[PDB]
Ligand binder design. Sequence first.
Ligand SMILES: NC(=O)c1ccc[n+]([C@@H]2O[C@H](COP(=O)([O-])OP(=O)(O)OC[C@H]3O[C@@H](n4cnc5c(N)ncnc54)[C@H](OP(=O)(O)O)[C@@H]3O)[C@@H](O)[C@H]2O)c1
Ligand SMILES: NC(=O)c1ccc[n+]([C@@H]2O[C@H](COP(=O)([O-])OP(=O)(O)OC[C@H]3O[C@@H](n4cnc5c(N)ncnc54)[C@H](OP(=O)(O)O)[C@@H]3O)[C@@H](O)[C@H]2O)c1
Ligand code: NA
Ligand code: NA
Ligand code: NA
Ligand code: NA
Ligand code: NA
Ligand code: NA
Lengths: 312, 312
Amino acid sequence: MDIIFYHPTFDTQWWIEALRKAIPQARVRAWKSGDNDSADYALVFSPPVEMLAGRDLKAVFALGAGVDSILSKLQAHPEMLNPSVPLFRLEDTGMGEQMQEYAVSQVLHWFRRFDDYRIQQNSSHWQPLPEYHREDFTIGILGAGVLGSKVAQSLQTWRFPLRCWSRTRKSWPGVQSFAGREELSAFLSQCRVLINLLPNTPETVGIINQQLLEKLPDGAYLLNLARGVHVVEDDLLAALDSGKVKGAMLDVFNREPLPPESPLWQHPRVTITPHVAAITRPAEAVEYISRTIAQLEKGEKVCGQVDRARGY
Amino acid sequence: MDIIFYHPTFDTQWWIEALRKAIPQARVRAWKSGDNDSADYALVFSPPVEMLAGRDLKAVFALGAGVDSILSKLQAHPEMLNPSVPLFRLEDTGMGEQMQEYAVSQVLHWFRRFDDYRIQQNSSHWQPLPEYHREDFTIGILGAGVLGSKVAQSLQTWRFPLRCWSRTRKSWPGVQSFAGREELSAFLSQCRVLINLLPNTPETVGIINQQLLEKLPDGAYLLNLARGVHVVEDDLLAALDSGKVKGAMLDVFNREPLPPESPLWQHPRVTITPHVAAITRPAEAVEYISRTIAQLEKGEKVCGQVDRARGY
Ligand SMILES: NC(=O)c1ccc[n+]([C@@H]2O[C@H](COP(=O)([O-])OP(=O)(O)OC[C@H]3O[C@@H](n4cnc5c(N)ncnc54)[C@H](OP(=O)(O)O)[C@@H]3O)[C@@H](O)[C@H]2O)c1
Ligand SMILES: NC(=O)c1ccc[n+]([C@@H]2O[C@H](COP(=O)([O-])OP(=O)(O)OC[C@H]3O[C@@H](n4cnc5c(N)ncnc54)[C@H](OP(=O)(O)O)[C@@H]3O)[C@@H](O)[C@H]2O)c1
Ligand code: NA
Ligand code: NA
Ligand code: NA
Ligand code: NA
Ligand code: NA
Ligand code: NA
């Protein structure tokens, strides 16, 4: 088999050698413009149209969890990916654990009021604060997917009440499952902490807006780990200023790098990380890709597959 | 049986009623000066000498995990507690989990470089930082006791390399156990994060000093959850300023409330909480005390007992 690889910023030489070692029967090469030699599999991130267009590939692997950019690209250039080509994405490959690290750290951070103590430390002010209680600290997770379930599981360890929201019902014992736009209000009403792990689709763009934020309990916390387009930044700023939202930690934004004029940077109740919540671990991705190719060759079921009509 | 209760700041009425409900055969009363009526058990925090002196109690329960103040008090007033009186302390009663919340949150906080991103956010500066790796993030725990083991266990969940230090060898699979002054250097040499859960004894006062801090790897983190007397604050400040210690989160200090003149308050790399790491949960303490009295009455073994010669 022949594998073509393309990523704009990763260590291409490392990946290619690791793929050769993991799939010894594969000829693995870096794709450059002009290469129209055959390929059975394409491993891509932000690929050019010319790399995929008119290729009857056996599969394409998107080297990330989110596929919103490939899809919108294929939207603008429908000839980029023939409809017979299955599209795969990275399911977990270390991003589950990284999302758990981020979510558990910050949730405990808010629950133990380290944000308040930091404000007080700024004034050299010593004052113990009343403790919060698990019953008042229900955590709602917006997507209930590969990453959503991982986060939920890690938070169950800490005995927080848990609820998730998705398109289809989930069966997680101890997590109250909400499904559909019609149940979104009920879900929101108890979320002391709202964690966003939705994919970017037309049905979810802008979903965290004034209408959503007003359904939250007062003094809620927003942890946006998914895509910046999910949040209407002005509505968030208004909810922060009214006390509706006590605090927000944001890893993604409508424009990235977040422009320095944005009020989010210097807002006392906002924490910013430069889109680093979860990046794939190359050794785990190489294991996942070679295992998936192997299952494809054996006729076994794989499932980590992107539904291009559904949008994720 | 007769129980006398004394605490300077807790809700005495709540405790007394909860103890009555949990031990229905007990007459439970709040101790006030002048009360020399009989008592089988004393539940005390920071008691006056007059409450205990010359009483042939069946047991005394210190309403906390640390007993350094009762002991030093009994040191200054040897008649306060007859040597036949067994002294008990609160083992866990919810402080294990609270120490796990604090330790896991901050360790992940440092490991994911949220401290660096916060510095950068202060300048509205957007920059992803190289990730840290578990192999370089060994966590050492200074005490290996009730709270030390709880913290170690919660950190094992996250796959950090773990090592503990104590007087006696421990048998925790996956945690490398160090014991005695003679092995303290070897223990320190790999501690990327040093978590202090020692009791305050004459053998441990001042142990975190220039000599200890220089044995640490560079860019270490100090998390002091035990007693302020363990840390020589000037030596810590010097290690912070030289880059030896990247960061310190401190819940306890040599004087409390930490005086506002202390450089710790405004130091960029120091986080301060007003001695709130772990407080006992009254319902869990009442359960532990009544269960312990019950075991004492049945002749079973209890063990949560303070060794007054040893100092903890
Ligand atoms: N560094 C970073 O910040 C970072 C890293 C990785 C990923 N991410 C983001 O995290 C997202 C989640 O990844 P994942 O692997 O967990 O995705 P996933 O397994 O595909 O899960 C997505 C979840 O969103 C739900 N969903 C989709 N559309 C919906 C709608 N209209 N209404 C309600 N629920 C809807 C799905 O419901 P069903 O279960 O019913 O299908 C699913 O539970 C990615 O899409 C990516 O944008 C961010
Ligand atoms: N809010 C707060 O900040 C807060 C709350 C609760 C407790 N604390 C502090 O946390 C401490 C720990 O409580 P705990 O219940 O975990 O106590 P513990 O079960 O008695 O454990 C103490 C540990 O320290 C070790 N140790 C004592 N002296 C030593 C020495 N000279 N050299 C080496 N190791 C020594 C002991 O070793 P062995 O196992 O060999 O005996 C033991 O493992 C308390 O004493 C208290 O000061 C703070
Ligand atoms: Na390339
Ligand atoms: Na993409
Ligand atoms: Na609680
Ligand atoms: Na009292
Ligand atoms: Na004490
Ligand atoms: Na790692």
